[PDB]
A paper describes a structure:
TPADO is an α3β3-nonheme RO, which catalyzes the NADH-dependent dioxygenation of TPA, the aromatic subunit of PET. TPADO forms an α3β3-heterohexamer, in which three catalytic α-subunits form a trimeric head-to-tail assembly atop a triad of noncatalytic β-subunits. Residues H210, H215, and D356 coordinate the ferrous ion in the active site, which is 12.2 Å away from the [2Fe-2S] cluster of a neighboring α-subunit and connected via the amino acid side chains H210, D207, and H105.
To understand the structural arbiters of substrate recognition, we determined the crystal structures of TPADO in the ligand-free state to 2.28 Å resolution and ligand-bound structures with TPA to 2.08-Å resolution and 2-OH-TPA to 1.95 Å resolution. During model building and refinement, clear continuous protein density was observed outside the α3β3-domains and identified as a single lysozyme molecule. In a rather fortuitous crystal packing, the lysozyme protein effectively acts as a crystallization chaperone that “glues” the TPADO molecules together, a function that, to our knowledge, has not been previously reported for lysozyme. More specifically, one lysozyme molecule forms interactions to five TPADO molecules and binds to both α- and β-subunits. The mononuclear Fe-coordinating residues H210 and H215 are located on an α-helix spanning residues 208 to 220. In the substrate-free structure, H215 does not coordinate the ferrous ion, and in all three α-subunits, the helix conformation is the same. The TPA binding pocket is more open within the substrate-free structure because the α-helical residues from H215 onward are disordered and not part of the model; in total, residues 215 to 227 are missing.
Author numbering:
A (entry chain H): 1 to 129
B (entry chain E): 3 to 222, 226 to 253, 269 to 420
C (entry chain F): 3 to 214, 227 to 247, 269 to 411
D (entry chain D): 4 to 214, 228 to 247, 268 to 410
E (entry chain B), F (entry chain C), G (entry chain A): 1 to 154
Write the structure that this text describes.
Amino acid sequence: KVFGRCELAAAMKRHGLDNYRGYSLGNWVCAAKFESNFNTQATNRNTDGSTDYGILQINSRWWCNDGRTPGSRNLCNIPCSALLSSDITASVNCAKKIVSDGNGMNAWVAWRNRCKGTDVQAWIRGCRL
Amino acid sequence: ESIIQWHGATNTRVPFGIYTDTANADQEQQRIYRGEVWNYLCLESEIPGAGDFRTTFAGETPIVVVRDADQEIYAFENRCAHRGALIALEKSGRTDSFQCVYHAWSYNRQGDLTGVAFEKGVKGQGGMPASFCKEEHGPRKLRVAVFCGLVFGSFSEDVPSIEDYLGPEICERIERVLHKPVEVIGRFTQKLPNNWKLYFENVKDSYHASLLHMFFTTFELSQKGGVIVDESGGHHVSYSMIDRGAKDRLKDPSLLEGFEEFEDGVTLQILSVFPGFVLQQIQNSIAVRQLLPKSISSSELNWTYLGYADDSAEQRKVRLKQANLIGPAGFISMEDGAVGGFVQRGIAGAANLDAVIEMGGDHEGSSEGRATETSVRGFWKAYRKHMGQEMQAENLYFQG
Amino acid sequence: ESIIQWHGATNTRVPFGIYTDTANADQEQQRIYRGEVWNYLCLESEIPGAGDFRTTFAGETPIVVVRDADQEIYAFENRCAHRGALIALEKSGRTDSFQCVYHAWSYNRQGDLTGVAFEKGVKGQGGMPASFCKEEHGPRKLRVAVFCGLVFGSFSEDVPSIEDYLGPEICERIERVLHKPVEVIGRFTQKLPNNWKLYFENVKDSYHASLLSQKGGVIVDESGGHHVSYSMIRLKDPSLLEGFEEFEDGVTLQILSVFPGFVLQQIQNSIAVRQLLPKSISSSELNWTYLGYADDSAEQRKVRLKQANLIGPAGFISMEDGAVGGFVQRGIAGAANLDAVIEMGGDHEGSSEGRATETSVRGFWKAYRKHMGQEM
Amino acid sequence: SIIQWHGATNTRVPFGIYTDTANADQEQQRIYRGEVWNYLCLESEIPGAGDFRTTFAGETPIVVVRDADQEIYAFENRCAHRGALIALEKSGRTDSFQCVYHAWSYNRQGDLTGVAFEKGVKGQGGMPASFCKEEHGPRKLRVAVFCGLVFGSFSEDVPSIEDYLGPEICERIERVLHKPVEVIGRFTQKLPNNWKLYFENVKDSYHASLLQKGGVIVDESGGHHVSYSMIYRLKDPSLLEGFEEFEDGVTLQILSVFPGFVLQQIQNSIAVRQLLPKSISSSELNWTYLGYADDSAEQRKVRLKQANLIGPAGFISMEDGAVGGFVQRGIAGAANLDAVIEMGGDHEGSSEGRATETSVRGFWKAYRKHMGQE
Amino acid sequence: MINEIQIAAFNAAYAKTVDSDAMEQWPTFFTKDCHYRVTNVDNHAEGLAAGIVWADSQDMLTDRISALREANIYERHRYRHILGLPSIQSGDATQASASTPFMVLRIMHTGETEVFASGEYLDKFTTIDGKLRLQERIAVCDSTVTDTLMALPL
Amino acid sequence: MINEIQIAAFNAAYAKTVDSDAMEQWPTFFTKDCHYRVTNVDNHAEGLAAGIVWADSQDMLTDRISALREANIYERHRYRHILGLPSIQSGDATQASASTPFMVLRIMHTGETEVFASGEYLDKFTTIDGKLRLQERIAVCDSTVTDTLMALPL
Amino acid sequence: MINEIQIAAFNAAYAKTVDSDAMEQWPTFFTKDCHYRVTNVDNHAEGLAAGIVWADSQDMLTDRISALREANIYERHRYRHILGLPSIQSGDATQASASTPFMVLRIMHTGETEVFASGEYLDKFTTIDGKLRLQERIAVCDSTVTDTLMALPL
Ligand code: FES
Ligand code: FES
Ligand code: FES
Ligand SMILES: [Fe+3]
């Protein structure tokens, strides 16, 4: 599924990611923009044998189990396939565990490079919130 | 210390140990089930064609019963004469001959050893010694009798004829019900948490049955009843009947909506044959029961539900509705499964005490009315006869 | 060939056959459970009003126990004097009289046959002979005794009074706990994979219990049969052990036993009763009755509910009590001809200041051999 | 008496022998704790010091354990105090054993090394002066190891395993256990039959032949045998695709040692069985499936495919679980009758045929000897 | 379409009704002119019609429960239904034919737990006022044996 | 709305945790101020409050498992949970009350398999950081009898 | 994506196939190159590879059933599978690993009903030409003990 910007904002708010561990809704929307382009099926093989899954591009060596990745830690205790659904529940719950690990949202490369300290709140403007 | 001590020559007192003593149970196997009795095996209509067989039990002892090409029925012990394996492993089937799966010994439908795998060695090496003869080895064959389609077997050649064993009164009461071709309409088994004897006493307990039937007509025509007992004591009939042509709750009354099909007023007829056969007619509900012992405190009750082959759709439907009266969930017979157990458990600390059976006096013969235990005392007259438990020598000397 | 051969007169040696011989078990039924003992039946508070009854066991033998209008408690064997069926089929209830369902014989609350269905026939046909008399047929009645809310039953005319049976030291130790009305707050049953004797030994095993600034002791009545084990002055939720003062001594633990299967226990504010029944040579049943006092506040009751985690089938303290019996049952499988060794605290079968002793265990066997005619 | 032998011959076995509970208790004191070797485990299953397992010699639970000296010891699993099991685990590794009931300590030989509160607490209670640790202990077993097979006996008087086995069966064991073996699976079968029925069945060449060139050998006692054999379509014939690894032609060798050890080779399928009695009409069969430590991937795969022939679902051995029960149930009315065992005559020695019951009669020669039933 | 989830939900409510001894609600799961039968695989294989329980109207179900309350004597016990997933054989928006595996434990008041019956419900479902009802349920038991007696229906 | 599928999934994860001996994860299924109790239908029918296990905090659950590891002695065994469909009594988007049937097999290390307990979980669910947690679970057992002892919670 | 609903449906059909003695349809559930194994928790914990049943092709499954029909002699009996919810352990866009709890009752023709096995299916699923198939199923049994024999696969 390709989300609309505001659709995804509304779904992230209704899952309580607004100000979650410091981070306003716009950070989460901006992160998904530059991680996956709002595509729940986004999939990126790394040369390290790991893959990044779903709308928040969650890594298969640390966070979810894809059955293909040597040294899986599977710290969200989920198969990676649950991060490829039309429904963002499992992706958000794993995110909440990732952002709580305490490197904050720096965990999301594309969020550092393209979102950190920008006007974040822009990704939420013009949305029924 | 013998907990099998009979009080006197009368059956008004039963030692509770009779339901507990394991040595006494093994005697029941040798002296009753493999003694001068007829064991109910199956209906002839359940093995109609040549080769059709069933497996069942006479007491502890497994049995094959089979139709041959001659249209006669045979039965033999289900024990290979080699090292003792069951021969037939199936509840039922059709076969030309039986074969032990262990070492492929062949038996004909009479139970004769017809074949021994490698009898004559392999390349003149091993096999049976020259002294060995097939015809000297075989399972025990049973004398078979078929009476109104009921197939019975005895291990004794000397057992009286089924007609003499039953007596004329019971012969007629069976013919009354099995007067036409019957059709099996279902089978169910109950595992009873009680010694076999407790269930068979209960079949014969007219006191219990009248108590319950009397309770059942607090709900919804004057009836008289009676209890017949053969000369041996072992067989009974409990009946109830209207006088055809006298004057004078349920959301679906159809359960009791019956139809007339015997030339008499008999609404209920429960017939028993020592040591474990029951034939019943309750309105239009016809059935056979086979009672087997399993363990000192367990027994098996096998129901064969019956229709008549000539039943119309509507007549058969009536028997299917009335089946709700009988079997494991019967409006009438439900409690019959549990009361045996209530006794088994009530006597746990009373192995040395005696049951009291005085209803209708000392007698072991027929009676008008059902507030009696004559058919129960009859069971024990027959039992003690077969078990050699009449007054002994020493105790007879002292009394006389 | 006899595996129930005692080594000496001393009780430092128990033949392992005692836990296996089936003939010996049937003697235990005749000589102990239906002999000169008091069998625990129930609490008086479980049958408060007239007609309130329970069913239970005295050894193998099922029992009815019931309150009558006179406010007295009666007990009789749960066996119909007709053909032997259980009379009362329910764990508990209230009734005017008992009736065997098989042929509708009626019994009053004393266990007297008051009624025989169709005694006089139906339309002058059958019924009982003229010579038959209701008052000559009946279940064996039990003598009942009460002590501070505990109901006991005996089959023996000759059994001493409950006060004489218990003795004065055990009488005082019971009254200490049961000095007020108690209220049942839960029941649980454990099926133990062991001969009853192994669990009762274990209740009395101060040696075992001490393995799981306080001084303790062990009291034994004159017969040997009854004991008291006593004790007196990391967790994320220490509230489990947050107690309150309610005994006018310092005693934090009192485990009391009465031959052949009664336990009363006080562990801080955790009060309970146990009934031990034999079931088969290698199985027994333990019935727990957890207790509050009727006058308990909300906060006091909460404490007993938290402290209950110490006791019962999953008890921090009592969990293992379920299994050790079985460990013995299985360890002795090839040793029916050998003897248990019970020498801790000497030959003694009386009270001791230590708890590193087996005096209360040897006591059990003194009382056992007395009842079983096994002394020498 | 349903355990009355007809004559001295063993062509007739009283069916009561499978039923009499008094006779079973005699089997415990005269066979399992008599002049026999009971199979315990493989030495490779307890390789390192402290490595132990628990099992049974008849009814009697047993601990078997490796010590620092690299020797193996075995003792009755019974605390010398009040009789509790000492070791509660199928297997593990320990410095010493401790009874959980009252914390008595035992070394790996089964010696009592420690008694909780032996000397009282504050000079109160404890053991009398007369009590001596070294006078109390579980029965220790004589241990023997032969090609890695660990056996235990209660009897000082029992011969050595080489003398017990005899030379023919010693060589037949060495044949297959000639190298280091590796456990590749365990499975247990609960058999609804008296132990004797399954052990007879292991020895029953008559049965096995029904289910080209072969023979049956029997030791001098009668108790041990070897059965041996040599040379719709399968969509995957790979199940029988084998490889050569014995210096003879023998594609099947089934070896038994009184009263409950089996070693088998069926093509490339190697396994050991332990037969324990449990109740008059139940027994336990413990399978230890084996590879050789030096197996290649492809050789191991062959043993994994050929294992489908053996154990609880074996194309060959499935029936072996049930036939005992078939006999137990067929004789339910015949406690007073006799089994007929005349195939190959009265003989209780080796034969070139397999249409014989000589190894079965051998079992009963050995049985009656141990039980004083000649 | 009537589906696997709707039947599963229906089955769990049926089970809770029977297991909670709210037996008076049990006939409400059936149509007025329903069929209910307890039988076994042997009878079902040979085409034999008789049942331990046999009913061809909801009223007959109501009478069986009257008799349980007011007539039958039996030692106290309860059922614990453990159910598998339904399989639908055929069906449209309003009828469906389905099979559901079952296990029933029996727990005696004295505390013994036993597997009392197992098998499958051969069901015919219909839809009345938008809700699922049984036109037909045949409890086909795996065992020919019932221990002691059958008081409560499956 | 919290639904039957979400509770079923929660129940299967609870079951796997207890059945896999991952007992340290078991308290994480409960709120800080939760109630957990193992009782039976006799106690529940009277209103008797005692449990074989009785806990009114997650910390009490944690201590019970510490004691299982550090203190309690018992013969090795595992549980196999077979669960029914949850039936929801009340609930909004965040709370729910529900009953779930259960059966627990006990398998000893020696291989014996027995029905060890059966009954229903009377549950109160809440939602913490968008996940289901038990505010309350009462394991109401069908039998008054526990075989040998209870080491692992239900 | 392979999901919990698809595996549930697959598991119910697998169960029905084995429990109905339609054993010829049993290999249809597997890929050509599949692995099937019956083992126990002890073997699975110690890394031991052997099975009571061991197959590395659909053809070997087909042969096992040929031999059951044509060759193997065993006393008549039937299975009753009660399954739990599948729980997906791993997956990508096309493959999935899952665990499904199971209990198998064995019912003899003579009527005895026993818990014959329990454990979990450790499964590898794929989806080929629109059909969900087992690449792998390991029946990991909770007990080291099989009663009498194992004729039918789990
Ligand atoms: S036992 Fe029947 S052929 Fe050998
Ligand atoms: S047995 Fe009690 S009234 Fe007959
Ligand atoms: S029984 Fe072993 S220490 Fe007491
Ligand atoms: Fe064989």
